[PDB]
Ligand binder design. Structure first.
Ligand SMILES: Nc1ncnc2c1ncn2[C@@H]1O[C@H](COP(=O)(O)OP(=O)(O)O)[C@@H](O)[C@H]1O
Ligand SMILES: [Mg+2]
Length: 304
């Protein structure tokens, strides 16, 4: 049940931002300590350097393809029956959706592509895998099918489902295409896109991988790819408590975990416990105008 935290600094939006009054310096991974550190300083007091450590830090030069080089190995563990959770955390504008859904290389598209390649490869070993998914949103602690919804936890299989939620088989790149196209259009920022709403809700792309080796072996693993509501400072209190609860749970898992204190953590409890693997992605802007929210985000990531 390993937990890791990565930080990703997105490229500056030239013509809109600059780093005139702040500095974010990323150090090279430290193989003697096993982590990578970064320093953040505000011009108003350059003697105060805030240091942060992460399992890996991606800078403005790291593309989505670069990011996946470090995520591919995590997601493939689902074919072995491990559950996986990947959370994109950060203020609105930091790059959560781009990271998770950018057409072709986002974490979700890359994951599906990667899993498919592994499935085809595993066929030569007598393995037969079936893939199905759901795309939901949690807004104001209520579940919404983005494609009555009650959470059903099966203590027997240690699996979870949601009643009346659309689930689609993923047996073709064509089905993946239309679904990922709809997902992006729904969450990405487009004129006729509900970004306002999207920024205030959590979206979860769920992928179930069921395999059978007619060796007689069987395998079931679930991947939960979450694009969290913006972390920037009753709907607002819902977001605050939900993110805070998630932080409490992830941190507790890394040490009574408060899974039931939020809809999100309650939904994913089986994918957060046992030998499940969790990756927390903290997205931040490199710009001086966002420096305070950036420091907030980095502080949340630390305790996590
Ligand atoms: N890694 C990145 N590389 C290039 N552009 C990015 C990257 N991350 C975000 N962006 C751009 O920054 C803006 C913030 O995008 P978005 O992903 O929607 O943020 P958030 O989901 O956190 O609110 C978008 O216009 C997006 O295209
Ligand atoms: Mg977004």
């Amino acid at each position: 049940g390993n937990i890791r935290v990565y930080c990703r600094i997105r490229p500056a939006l030239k013509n809109l931002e600059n780093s005139d009054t702040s500095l974010i310096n990323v150090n090279e991974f430290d193989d003697n300590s096993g982590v990578q550190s970064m320093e953040v300083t505000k011009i108003q007091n350059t003697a105060q350097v805030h240091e942060f450590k992460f399992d890996k830090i991606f800078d403005q030069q790291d593309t989505n393809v670069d990011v996946f080089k470090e995520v591919g190995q995590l997601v493939q563990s689902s074919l072995d029956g491990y559950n996986v959770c990947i959370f994109a955390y950060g203020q609105t504008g930091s790059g959560k959706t781009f990271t998770m859904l950018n057409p072709g290389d986002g974490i979700i598209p890359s994951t599906i592509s990667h899993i498919f390649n592994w499935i085809n490869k595993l066929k030569t070993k007598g393995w037969d895998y079936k893939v199905n998914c759901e795309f939901i949103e949690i807004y104001n602690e209520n579940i919404v099918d983005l494609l009555k919804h009650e959470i059903r936890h099966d203590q027997e299989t240690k699996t979870t489902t949601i009643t009346n939620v659309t689930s689609c088989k993923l047996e073709s790149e064509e089905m993946v295409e239309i679904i990922l196209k709809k997902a992006n259009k729904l969450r990405s920022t487009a004129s006729t896109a509900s970004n306002e709403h999207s920024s205030r809700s959590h979206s979860i792309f769920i992928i179930h991988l069921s395999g059978s080796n007619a060796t007689g072996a069987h395998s079931y693993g679930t991947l939960n790819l979450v694009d969290l509501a913006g972390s920037e400072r009753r709907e607002t209190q819902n977001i605050n408590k939900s993110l805070s609860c998630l932080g409490d749970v992830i941190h507790a898992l890394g040490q009574h975990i408060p899974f039931r204190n939020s809809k999100l953590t309650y939904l994913l409890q089986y994918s957060l416990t046992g030998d499940s693997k969790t990756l927390m992605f903290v997205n931040i802007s490199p710009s001086s105008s966002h420096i305070n929210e950036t420091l907030n985000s980095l502080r949340f990531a630390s305790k996590v």
